[PDB]
Amino acid sequence: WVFGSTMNNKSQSVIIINNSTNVVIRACNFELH
Amino acid sequence: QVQLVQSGAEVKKPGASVKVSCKTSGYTFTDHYMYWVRQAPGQGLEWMGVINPDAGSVTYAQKFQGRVTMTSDTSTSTVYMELSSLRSEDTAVYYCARDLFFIPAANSFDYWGQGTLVTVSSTKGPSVFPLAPSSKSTSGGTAALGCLVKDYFPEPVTVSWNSGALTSGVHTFPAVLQSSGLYSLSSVVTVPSSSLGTQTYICNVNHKPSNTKVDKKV
Amino acid sequence: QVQLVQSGAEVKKPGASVKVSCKTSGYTFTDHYMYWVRQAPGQGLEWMGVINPDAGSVTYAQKFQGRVTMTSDTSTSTVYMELSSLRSEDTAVYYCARDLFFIPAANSFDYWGQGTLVTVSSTKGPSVFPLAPSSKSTSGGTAALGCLVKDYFPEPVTVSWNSGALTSGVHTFPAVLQSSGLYSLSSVVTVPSSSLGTQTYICNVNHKPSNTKVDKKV
Amino acid sequence: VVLSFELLNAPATVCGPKLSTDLIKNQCVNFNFNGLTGTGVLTPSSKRFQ
Amino acid sequence: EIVLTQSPATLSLSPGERATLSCRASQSVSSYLAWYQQKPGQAPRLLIYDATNRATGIPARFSGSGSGTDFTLTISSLEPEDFAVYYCQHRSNWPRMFTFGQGTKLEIKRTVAAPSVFIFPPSDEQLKSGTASVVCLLNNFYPREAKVQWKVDNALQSGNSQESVTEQDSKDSTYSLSSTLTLSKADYEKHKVYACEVTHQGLSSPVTKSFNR
Amino acid sequence: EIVLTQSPATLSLSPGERATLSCRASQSVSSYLAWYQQKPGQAPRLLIYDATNRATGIPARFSGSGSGTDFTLTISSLEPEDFAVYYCQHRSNWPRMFTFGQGTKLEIKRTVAAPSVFIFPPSDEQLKSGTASVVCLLNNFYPREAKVQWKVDNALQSGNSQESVTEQDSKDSTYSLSSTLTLSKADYEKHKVYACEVTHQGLSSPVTKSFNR
Amino acid sequence: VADYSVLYNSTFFSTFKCYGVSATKLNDLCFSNVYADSFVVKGDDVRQIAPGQTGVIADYNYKLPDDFMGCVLAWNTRNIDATSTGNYNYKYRYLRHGKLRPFERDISNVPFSPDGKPCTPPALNCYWPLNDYGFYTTTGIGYQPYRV
């Protein structure tokens, strides 16, 4: 569930993802797996 | 005749306020739009700066909204400009011009002032360093000399040769803003090779704010 | 003859208390108004400083109310001054003078003391750095030298030339309080150019509190 | 009569008549009658004011 | 705001011909355009106001035109005291706005002269205080096109070289250029062969002058 | 408290004339004024008490006057051992207050002499410890008016220069001035042209002496 | 393991104004997880950083809650983060639709406009939403860089 704000590289966004029993909570990626 | 007399030069620190006036005379200063312009070196001027002398209405540009504040005086007939937060790109000559129409209407500029050189930097002094008259580069029957001055920002000066005697090859190169923050003046002269050694060629510096005149022979 | 003998020098830390006495002799010290003044370098003195020796009444100024406290002794006939909260503007010479009238009346000062140099700062050691006798600046038939000393606060000394032999050009420049917090002494001498090299010119330092005497030839 | 108008970006000495909302009666609404604020139902009666 | 774009930005003609100064706006603005005439060193002067009326004191040789988006300034006969930079001002209607252009230089057309190449080695007085600089003289050239490049042991050099060009002379109609190569004291003794490259249109081959220290 | 203001604050006369010392108060005070005489270096000495009576030991040449707000001190014949600073003390009545003035300088009037211009370059011994300073000598000048300014590459300098002036000599009646330009070790080698500007009244042109290192 | 001993002995703090808790009682009480901040104000903006104060730096730059529990620590940097030629390296937002919320960030560089229709930086009613401070070293005590 990619939480955040207006996409297309305008604000920070939280990307909570679980891959193989690993909860990688990254909240710095943008949108220009 | 309508004429607008301004003030002289005024150097100010990067962060202080500048107060430049614009004295008008020769006409009835009651209904006339007053403007203000400033031509940057190499660049141009683009802003309105129209102020109503009679009323208390003022108008500024978009890039300069809260940095510049102007006022008028119906008694002395002289407007005042107060530009705060002086940057390193606003050091140029400021002009004040009137309008062709009256207050209700608006038109282009018709009567201009004289200019007000405003500079925002540190102060320094010049240094007369003569060049080297190389005899190898004398192709063409003539020769060349020079009075290349060192770095100095305030330059209300003028150059000559032999106190203005020689008037052949008096082309003065304009100064440039180096990376340090000062200006360097260049001045050469083309003289025949037959006058080498016999005739003297000594430039003269007339720097008034420094009160120093150094005459060095090349 | 009425005479007032005081103490010597007394250096105190910025925040401690200073106790300076004022010994009086030669007259009946029973009914006489005693005063206290202090001339600051460059500035002046403005306060009453009147204390009753017989009774126990004291009088202070407005700027110095709870910082200075005085007392008297009818047995030893000597008043004592206690000034607390010594700031950086109290380093000067303190004087004590009597009055022309008696205790009930009041008049101007007639008999003065000798002075008490009270300084409030730190101490250090001096250094003898000779100047450079440039032969180019010898216009006028004579020359010049120097024994510019380094920064040192305590200066109860005097300068001379060749242990007092040469008495021509003994002008001693007063010391100044630099930004560091110490003083610097200057001493030059004007001698003819014909005596350059032959006659020796060596100053003599007599700094007693430091017990250091360095004689350097220029 | 030729009237002239100036539109300089400066504090205007004259703008016009301040628009006032309509009289909303028989409804609990907020009212501001020159300082007197609050909330009430504007309803008339037979009182005789001075 | 309405911006003004000037495509030519320069006009090199001879005294006696007609000028082709242009002033184009961005959108379809009205005829509220006004040109100017600012002599280099002096104060600006109005030339034509509202693009359809003649100003006071302006001779009959100046006559502007234009309507909407195709404006032009046609001078009848050029005068030697009329060669300066011309700026056109565009005014808005509602928010009392005024916009200016960029300016078009009007230099007197003259035959292509050969730029005199001269180099000045630094003196020993400047070497004692550091900041050694070499000056290359480029005077007597009509076209404002000269690439002054130094040869640091048969290589290039940039960033530490500033060029200064004078104005057009009134006697011989020539220009003057002086380049300064800012270096260090310990760096000047590292190299010995210093050359000044001159790239000019009237020169069939780049003139390179060097000296031996 | 009543403050004392001295407008002249100086009196340069020759031995043999009459003095015009003044002492003016703020309000309309009484005649409770008393002058003093403090020799530079020695202890102060009473001159006239209550502004209407002569003190003990004072010769007949000193005779003061004044009443209310117009006080003056008129000396009959000036003496070479009487040239010192004179202070007047004003006393209040109720709260046992005593106020003093500022003092007036009395120096022997001599002829305007050209101040000797001399500059001393720093030695290599001081460079090994840093804090390089240049000393400029200005002696043999009557009027206490000299603008000592350093030429840092033909420029001005202030804040880092302290001047010291001596007292009046008894042989030739001249003064002495010595200025010290406090600088840094790494800053002295940055500049080479050091000059000392001497602006004096008796000099028709500012004498400038410099040296090359 | 905190000590809170290097903050009370020294006196280089400009405004040591704690909110919610007292400074003299932080040596005994423990916490779960503390959160520190780092930003440079224009000297006179320290008073705006308070639970209830407003202005131009406390509405769309850094919002503090009314029930904040912590301490504000500001100290002058007139010689560490200042330059005589210019220190144009810090900016602040002064144009944004609506105030922010406590402990929020608004890092963005889009142009500002009252209505919609995203405009370009060259426009008539559209300007940059951020402006540089302009810290110097030859000004008064007000225009000085303070790290809070």
Residue numbers in the entry:
A (entry chain B): 101 to 132, 149
B (entry chain E), C (entry chain G): 1 to 218
D (entry chain B): 497 to 546
E (entry chain D), F (entry chain F): 1 to 213
G (entry chain C): 349 to 496
Passage from the reporting paper:
In this study, we reported the isolation of potent and broadly neutralizing mAbs from a vaccinated donor with a special five-dose COVID-19 vaccination schedule. One mAb, named PW5-570, displayed the most potent neutralizing activity against all SARS-CoV-2 strains prior to BA.5 variant, and another three mAbs, named PW5-4, PW5-5, and PW5-535 were found to broadly neutralize all sarbecoviruses tested, including all the current SARS-CoV-2 variants, SARS-CoV, Pangolin-GD, RaTG13, WIV-1, and SHC014. Cryo-EM analysis demonstrates that these antibodies have diverse neutralization mechanisms, such as disassembling spike trimers, or binding to RBM or SD1 to affect ACE2 binding.
To understand the broad neutralization mechanism of PW5-5, we determined the cryo-EM structure of PW5-5 complexed with the stabilized prefusion ectodomain of Omicron XBB S (6 P) and SARS-CoV S (2 P), respectively. As no complex of SARS-CoV S trimer with 3 PW5-5 Fabs was observed, we propose that binding of the third Fab resulted in the disassembly of the S trimer. In summary, the binding of PW5-5 induces RBD into an extra-wide-open state, resulting in S trimer instability and disassembly. The S RBD–PW5-5 Fab region was locally refined to 3.04 Å resolution. PW5-5 interacts with SARS-CoV RBD in a similar way, burying 978 Å2 surface area. Sequence alignment between SARS-CoV and SARS-CoV-2 in the RBD region showed that PW5-5 epitopes were highly conserved, with 11 of the 13 residues in contact with SARS-CoV-2 being identical, and the high similarity between the two RBDs was consistent with PW5-5’s cross-reactivity in binding and neutralizing SARS-CoV. Compared with S2H97 (IC50: 2046 ng/mL), PW5-5 has significantly enhanced neutralizing activity against SARS-CoV (IC50: 10 ng/mL), increasing by ~200 times.
